[PDB]
């Protein structure tokens, strides 16, 4: 295990914990705000995936300050994880190309 593959893996586990904590905390944040749809755990979990990937369909979104603060942490964990996989793939390819050039 090279750093880049350990980091990629670490980021995958950590993203899964953020999707779950974020589902829980969003529901807690959002109930009490009239009109809020982000208020049961199963679709909160769907919401957290859709936010973390940045698809953002808009079937669900938080309307409270704390729902929105939670949503910002999910966006950033998701963009960073997926960026940390791209960076780990780039590290693999560069090494392979060196080895091939005979370097």
């Amino acid at each position: 295990s090279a750093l880049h593959w350990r980091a990629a893996g670490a980021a995958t586990v950590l993203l899964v914990i953020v999707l779950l904590a974020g589902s829980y905390l969003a529901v807690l944040a959002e109930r009490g705000a009239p009109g809020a749809q982000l208020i049961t755990y199963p679709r909160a979990l769907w919401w957290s995936v859709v936010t973390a990937t940045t698809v953002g369909y808009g079937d669900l979104y938080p309307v409270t300050l704390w729902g929105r603060c939670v949503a910002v942490v999910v966006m950033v964990a998701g963009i960073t994880s997926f960026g940390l996989v791209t960076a780990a793939l780039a590290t693999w390819f560069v090494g392979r190309e060196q080895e091939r050039r005979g370097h």
Epitope: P34, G35, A36, Y41, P42
Partner: antibody, heavy 118, light 106 residues
Framework: QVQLQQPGAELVKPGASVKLSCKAS????????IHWVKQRPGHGLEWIGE????????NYNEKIQKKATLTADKSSSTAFMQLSSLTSEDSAVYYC???????????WGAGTTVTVSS | DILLTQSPAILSVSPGERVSFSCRAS??????IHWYQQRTNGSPRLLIK???ESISGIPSRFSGSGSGTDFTLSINSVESEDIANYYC?????????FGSGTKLEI
Amino acid sequence: QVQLQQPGAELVKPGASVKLSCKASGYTFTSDWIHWVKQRPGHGLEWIGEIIPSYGRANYNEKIQKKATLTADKSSSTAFMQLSSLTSEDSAVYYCARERGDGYFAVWGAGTTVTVSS
Amino acid sequence: DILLTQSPAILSVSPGERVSFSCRASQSIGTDIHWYQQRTNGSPRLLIKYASESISGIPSRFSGSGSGTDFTLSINSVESEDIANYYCQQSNRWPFTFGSGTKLEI
């Protein structure tokens, strides 16, 4: 098993308060909300409010005069609703129900009949 | 806050016949509608959740249907144990609200 356990009745004097209770058993998750519903004699059900015992966070029906204050004791698996400064408009049956956070009341208490009289 | 309208308030059917209770929502709530039975001096009892999904415990006689603003609980072959008050409740938007309710009467 009986999952929610409520007292059968309380008498309360006009202007007095009372602390209703609800002892849960069976599966008691972190994810669980306890709800309180008020049924006046020959009327329908009114959602009054909800507490999550794990966090102790509570929301109320703001469409009505606020009489309730929801508290949970996580050690004794018990939800409380303090109803204060009661008139006769407040005479009713109050149920607790358990919602798993997917939006429906799976399991109800038998309810507490609260009579406000002198 | 969402408004659950249950009309009519009383429903008179003959023994063995099919009965339908209506719930109309004031704005679209998908299928986030659940139905409770309350017999004289009983607690409410979940019958249907998510509009059409069965709860085990419940005679197959009980069905539900509907999507958006129009929901229906059905009892195919009403029997005497069905005499009760039927309520709808939505979980689409905060807070949870109930219907005004419908008395079945044989």
